Subunit: 502 residues, 4 copies
């Protein structure tokens, strides 16, 4: 702590993944190009908003912008596509027939909440439609109703037959399709609804890399999501979003069933006391690091940058601390979706994460993740931990890993080497999904499968050498670690070589 040098510059290699929510402000092809250059690694599409056609056009735009860099495979960056589900939630309608329109609420003003489907696209400062039909039976005379991540509070004054009359307890902007939270109250909502099924099936068709599953409360919820994705979506990674008291207390069984976790602080910070979020966050990140599964810190990380070109000091702190905690990915929501400075938001995340990674003392973290990690017979596991240990020993410029499914690179990443992990694959999905794991730099090889297997290995290794040289991870005289197998196919990585850069 005391020997932290501020006048010491960090490397160009950023290890933490940046996830960006794509909406009205960042949807265009030209913006998305600059998003990738700024350091976007994953595009998140929020299915609480917009239509299937809307999201399909966005996915197309993301891919168009991504593939404009495809001509140079050495410098090409894979960008993942993520589907964020609705889940068992209560949401508002469209303001003035638009997904963009907002109305200003005054403190003390009257607001009627209707269940009438005709007002679902005609919401304003006087009337607001909600999609929860059983709402009048779960609220009391004086109950508190929160809207848009708790932004606006509403006290029940009148409880009618098909409506609720409330008073605005605090002012602020109300937009379209905003989340409604009822702390303590019991919601009969299913884990996977009919809309969820259709959205999940749509993701399979659109060829998504991962699903961010909203409001996961238990292990059986994760199994339901996986069953809906079926055999077609068996390789689609499921990231369980923990955003309520139920998901926190049953986190262990959820983590076990999921391919990864997201700390969804927006909803979580109203579902549980705001002063307890940091505890849950640090608990979840630690357990994910221990289990070797991806964890995302999300929501309101640079909230003030929606309206402003520079973050608050608390926001600088937040991003940095999330990385220091051990988060694999950091996330931008409204900051890229609807804000005035989406590029600045991404750029700020690049800079803070890069600084935070230089602050992490890697040896102590590895030594702990080492003795905590159990004894296994798995050859790939032993080769991974042997390579990470060797990387610290010879101050390697990289750890080159050849991988078809990603698994080998994931096993190296869980021991948190300082050296960047260059994951060479021919599988495009594997290259996109690699961004979920801290310190993996995925590179897609499109060279034809070579006649002799030994020469196919050497070519892929040489490809990584060229990538590292061009990006600046290493130069001619440098020492690197190469991980390969003894035969083609997944699950055969058993070889570690200490080689000079050609």
């Amino acid at each position: 702590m005391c020997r932290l040098d501020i006048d010491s510059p960090p490397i160009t290699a950023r290890n933490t993944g940046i996830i960006c929510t794509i909406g009205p402000a960042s949807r265009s092809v030209e913006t998305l190009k600059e998003m990738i250059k700024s350091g976007m690694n994953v595009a998140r599409l929020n299915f609480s908003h917009g239509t299937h056609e809307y999201h399909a056009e966005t996915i197309k735009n993301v891919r168009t912008a991504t593939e404009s860099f495809a001509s140079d495979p050495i410098l090409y960056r894979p960008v993942a596509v993520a589907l964020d589900t609705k889940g068992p939630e209560i949401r508002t309608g469209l303001i003035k027939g638009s997904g963009t329109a907002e109305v200003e609420l005054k403190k003390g003003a009257t607001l009627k909440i209707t269940l009438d489907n005709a007002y679902m696209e005609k919401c304003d400062e006087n009337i607001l439609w909600l999609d929860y039909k059983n709402i009048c039976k779960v609220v009391e005379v004086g109950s508190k109703i929160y809207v848009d991540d708790g932004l606006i509070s509403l006290q029940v004054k009148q409880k009618g037959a098909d409506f609720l009359v409330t008073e605005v307890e605090n002012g602020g902007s109300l937009g379209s399709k905003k989340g409604v939270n009822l702390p303590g109250a019991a919601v009969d909502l299913p884990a996977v609804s009919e809309k969820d099924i259709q959205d999940l099936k749509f993701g399979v068709e659109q060829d998504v890399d991962m699903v961010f599953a909203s409001f996961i409360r238990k292990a059986s919820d994760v199994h339901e999501v996986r069953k809906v994705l079926g055999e077609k979506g068996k390789n689609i990674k499921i990231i369980s979003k923990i955003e309520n008291h139920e998901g926190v207390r049953r986190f262990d069984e959820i983590l076990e069933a999921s391919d990864g976790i997201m700390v969804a602080r927006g909803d979580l910070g109203i579902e549980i006391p705001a002063e307890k979020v940091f505890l849950a966050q640090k608990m979840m990140i630690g357990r994910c690091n221990r289990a070797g599964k991806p964890v995302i810190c999300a929501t309101q990380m640079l909230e003030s940058m929606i309206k402003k070109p520079r973050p608050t000091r608390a926001e600088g702190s937040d991003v940095a601390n999330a990385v220091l905690d051990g988060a694999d990915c950091i996330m931008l929501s409204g900051e890229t979706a609807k804000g005035d400075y989406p590029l600045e938001a991404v750029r700020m995340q690049n800079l803070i994460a890069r600084e935070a990674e230089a602050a992490i003392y890697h040896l102590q973290l590895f030594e702990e993740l080492r003795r905590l990690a159990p004894i296994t017979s798995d050859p790939t596991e032993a080769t991974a931990v042997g390579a990470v240990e060797a990387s610290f020993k010879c101050c390697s410029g990289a750890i080159i890993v050849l991988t078809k499914s990603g698994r080998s690179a994931h096993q190296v990443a869980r021991y948190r080497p300082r050296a960047p992990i260059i994951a060479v694959t021919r599988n495009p999905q594997t290259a996109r999904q690699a961004h979920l794991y801290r310190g993996i730099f995925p590179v897609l090889c499109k060279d034809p499968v070579q006649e002799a297997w030994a020469e196919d290995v050497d070519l892929r290794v040489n490809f990584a050498m060229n990538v590292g040289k061009a990006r600046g991870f290493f130069k001619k005289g440098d020492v690197v670690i190469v991980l390969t197998g003894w035969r083609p196919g997944s699950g055969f990585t058993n070889t570690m070589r200490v080689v000079p850069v050609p």
Copy 2:
């Protein structure tokens, strides 16, 4: 991994809360509620307001504080802090015509003038500022930042007594906003004529501490120390680190100072914003190791100026600052001018409490005790003995009798979990004790007993009564009591392990 969420924290909150006073929190009624909510130190910001204004503020603060004096057991001392203006650069007033704030669009040209004719006629074309020698210290290509670093300008043409700039980052420009010049060596005095006037006022008004703005070196601290003079020699100097040079020369500043404030507002503009966390954690750690108060400040709950609930980044920022090892946390605009000042204080009490319960206290003490050098000082030896004993018997408190505070400070250095109840007759000592994590000051107003042994146990029993009333411990519980062998400061040598009467 082992961190528990559904397990609520304990009664006592260790980290001090500093609140900036202004229009939103100036009345006696509001200040009473601030103290109820948890305010320990009231900060007076001398960048704004006359001496009359601040004298009234101190008057109000003391009225609210002394309304609880009827019960010395439950009485909570409130310190008064003076935050100096320092070598500040500010803009002029926006012209009467037009709007309250002028829009500065990206790519546009802006003229910076020093001509007093435009000092109350600022707009999107012409901007006045009060730093006379700006042209001498900036060059073509230099960056100029306005209004908490939200506006950015680059110098295109350097004139004789003017500057032609290009707007880089846009926004709304209001009246009298702060200006920063990173990289440039500003030649404004460390302690100006106004600063001298204000520091003297602080002495006369009997303030407890000074927050000295823009301390760049050790000699800056000495100047402040000299101005406070002999009459104000007991006033603690907290040096604000908020520029590049303050970071480079931190070690000599900390040595000269009584404590440090991580003033992240200006700091986050003078150096890159992505580097502030490094500086914050470096300074807190070094202060903890030195046994000196450290305050984390600025924008901790910004959105709570307008919103009754903080952002998730803000919730994290307050907690991480406590986990880092900060003795105090601060609110500025959240309490000075915001719509929800009491909610801001309450949120800091809540977060701080949770973070303290999260701290692995035994490991922290182990790390600090190992780094603490060997000394023949009896009080130091007694202090470490006390903290060690408090972890062994899960004591409800460490009772410390102190005149100047030093004995209680020495115990606080080793960061025990048990609350340190510092019994004192000195009113200033009880106020200044809030700068130190874990110290709960209690002011004994009882007459001094003729026999010294009976006087001690009177003050010890006073601590037993405070601890029972505030929920620190019960009759069955066991506590640690720190006393001395003779009257006067510098004689604490005795540690006793006694049950609660």
Copy 3:
């Protein structure tokens, strides 16, 4: 640890007084008043009387001589060193008779020669190289032809060639000196001996009458064995410390329950080294010492530590290493048997143990040992325990010359000793038994106050503290300017220590 292992310096002299207790067995070689005086000067803390040999008259005269030598230094209480008396029981053992009617006489057994083991009681004081008598009458049922019988801690191995009804004929498989009343071990064989024998009852009764400070209970196999010694000693011997000797497989296997019932432990290697495989003793020793350290109960390392010094004026390199490593393991006391009992160089043996132990103590990284014993120390409600930990931590902080403890029963001083301070613990007591028993605890320097109790209790406390201060200055623990820790209580009685003061030396 390896970083600190490399920094060990032989040119760095030990400047601190010796903490580890030295226990000597008293026999023919050290019985006289003249020799016992020199032994106390050389560093003897505890006299051990082995009741497997000699009679009650023999040991009573030995105790008398120990007390005569000890009290010859009593004129000056400042320099006076308390000397404890320890009774070592027979236990469920098998022993030989007297060689040629003498407890000192020896015979040379030669490899290959035949030897007859008889049960006939006419030979019990007439053993030689042809005939040997044992007290275990049920030996013919537990032994078969081909079985091996070990004599005197496995020194002599014998093989059974012919088995009779009341006699065994054996062959000497290896030569060596056979003495009187030596231990007989049959590993694996199921012996049916009681925990407390008829002879043990008489000896323990003798032990109470003679006012001994501690009992070294031989061949303790289980927790009910310790409870049985505790019951036999009764209310009369309730203050007598029971040190259970671990000497066999069952003793090691049931160590936890034994330690819990006992006041302390002795790692009795002589018999243990033959009852279990010799190559496994070091594990037993290290396991038991560590558990005793962590439990805060005294542990003794015993037997063959300087074995060659029985015949030679200097130890082997192995013996030099053995003492050192015993101290580094965490043994409160080290012991001499034959080296002091029958050897030609009893004084040189004690002196050598003083030298090695003092060197090993200087090598102990007290910063690390205290760190571990404190982290693993459980949460307490006892104020005496908390004051003790506070005092030890304060002593490392101000590099004290000593921790001064006023104690009645010793408990307060013992509670300080378990956290292993570097500073010597000057335990001031008016209780003579407390002063003697304190030698079982590492780092405690027991001082007996002879002064009459002052009317004012506060002035009586100050007199005892100043008395400790006089001892510390005289023995060279500290000078005038130095800083010490003083532990006292708030009221008269036992179990009231709660006050720690950091005071300068007058």
Copy 4:
């Protein structure tokens, strides 16, 4: 927590060095020595002629090569030469009277340099072979005889004689060693006899030299120069047995291939109570540097006359291994004793127990931490292999090596798993015994045409060896270390492979 009811593994890591003498010189006995676990045969050149030692080496090799018919089970046995050095020794006791003379405490004793008394020593008069003794000693100086058991103090100092008083008495025999603590003995570091003996060692193809009384780096360089290019591959193990040797340890270790803690002379030259400090210091520093350290002398001294050791000796052997010693040694136990085989067997049993007591991960954590960041690829591969061996509870680390170097680099990080070192160099196989945990296996199969298959052949050979010795079975996982090309210095490949 340590448990005696927990059985240790088959693999014993600490090498056993046995001094050969009249009690163990025969081919028949040496065969038993090897089976009981002798790894290195030590030849003490303080005694015997070149003719004598040549026959000893001949016997040791005959006994070693009797197992050569099965390469899978063949155990390499090293030959060590232990120099006389700057020794001081007494003369012969006179023919008349008893074979040994009793020296009594307080009695007067005269020390002479007159060659007429060199075989007429008695209780009144004694001769010794150090001609310049009077020049380096003063009145009051202490002189120790026969392993420090006899102590004399100078009372009168002449030109070529001494009058002493006996402090510690005892029985004095013939040609007994003399020590002069606190004296600057000016005898050559490498004498003319020493040169002859070292040249002889090169001729007889010895594996290592135990150089007596090394005081400084220049002494080591002198020994290195005598061995020359002809014997450059011979390892020099410096014996530390005086005060100057300890004081100048760092330069001695740097110059030498390894260290012996020669406790016999050390415990006389420095106070006996300080020997354990010097031992633990020197072992730690050797562990830190990755160089072999031998603990020697009196480890099981009573086993010269007794079939079972003392309890002090038991712990001594164990604590040597727990300290981190690579090799443990027997002198008189195997050379002249009544129970040489029992002494070897006992060291095998204690060392195996002590190795099971070591917390290997904690030791490896400290060894890796104190090791510098290097560019050396072999160094990095070794550290990765040891790490991987802890993670998958490997049955072994197989290392292909020519000079031993690659296996040595693994051995210094102290893995739990045995290091099977495959080599074709027979000298490498013998010298590998100096390093804790290395099990050298000599492949004698002809070099296969295809190099990739030649590597696989040696790897498969190690698999068969581990299977036969019971280190692992078919289902088990092992670590394999190989290089990218033939020749030394190219080890860079770690494989985790199942047993065939």
